[PDB]
Design a protein around this ligand. Structure first.
Ligand SMILES: Cc1ccc(-c2nc(Cn3cnc4c(N)nc(N)nc43)cs2)o1
Length: 167
């Protein structure tokens, strides 16, 4: 038993809520929050910009040091860094961004990173400004992640469609 509340159950291990991921992380302070990162860990917009802003740019400073030491992530890849004031840890995961010509098939590889953590709060990968269909995205999540994932979907219209249009 944990501190998540108000989630709709999708499968044995997947849950969903219409929530801003920043407000949810501040309220729950989970062990792991997932960031929808890019390979450079440049947290400009979407989930990444919003999480970074809530850490007063400390996430960006820690990320720049990580890149200066290790180089960029892979599309489909991840790294674990601090969660700052929002979580114990932040799992930065790079879903494919279709507006940059990135391969949609790498979305499954991105979600595989979640399996290294028993419980996560996370956004839908490659949704929002990353330009994938949040619904194909939810199907890959459900068919790939085996650990306990609490999804936050910010857009009410999108949430209603995903909960409805789910097979
Ligand atoms: C077609 C359509 C309508 C809305 C959207 C998008 N949603 C996202 C993901 N996202 C961005 N910011 C946040 C945030 N603060 N909280 C959560 N849970 N998700 C976030 C990217 S585009 O796409």
């Amino acid at each position: 038993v944990n501190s998540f509340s108000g989630y709709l159950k999708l499968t044995d291990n997947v849950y969903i809520k219409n929530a801003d991921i920043v407000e949810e992380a501040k309220k729950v302070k989970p062990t792991v929050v997932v960031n929808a990162a890019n390979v450079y860990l440049k947290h400009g917009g979407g989930v990444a910009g919003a999480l970074n802003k809530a850490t007063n740019n400390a996430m960006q400073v820690e990320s720049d040091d990580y890149i200066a030491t290790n180089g960029p992530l892979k599309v489909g890849g991840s790294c674990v860094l601090s969660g700052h004031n929002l979580a114990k840890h932040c799992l930065h995961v790079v879903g494919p961004n279709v507006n940059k010509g990135e391969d949609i098939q790498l979305l499954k590889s991105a979600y595989e990173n979640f399996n290294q953590h028993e419980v996560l709060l996370a956004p839908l990968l490659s949704a929002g400004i990353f330009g994938a269909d949040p619904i194909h995205s939810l199907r890959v999540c459900v068919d790939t992640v085996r650990t306990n994932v609490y999804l936050a979907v910010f857009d009410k219209n999108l949430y209603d469609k995903l909960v409805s249009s789910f097979l």
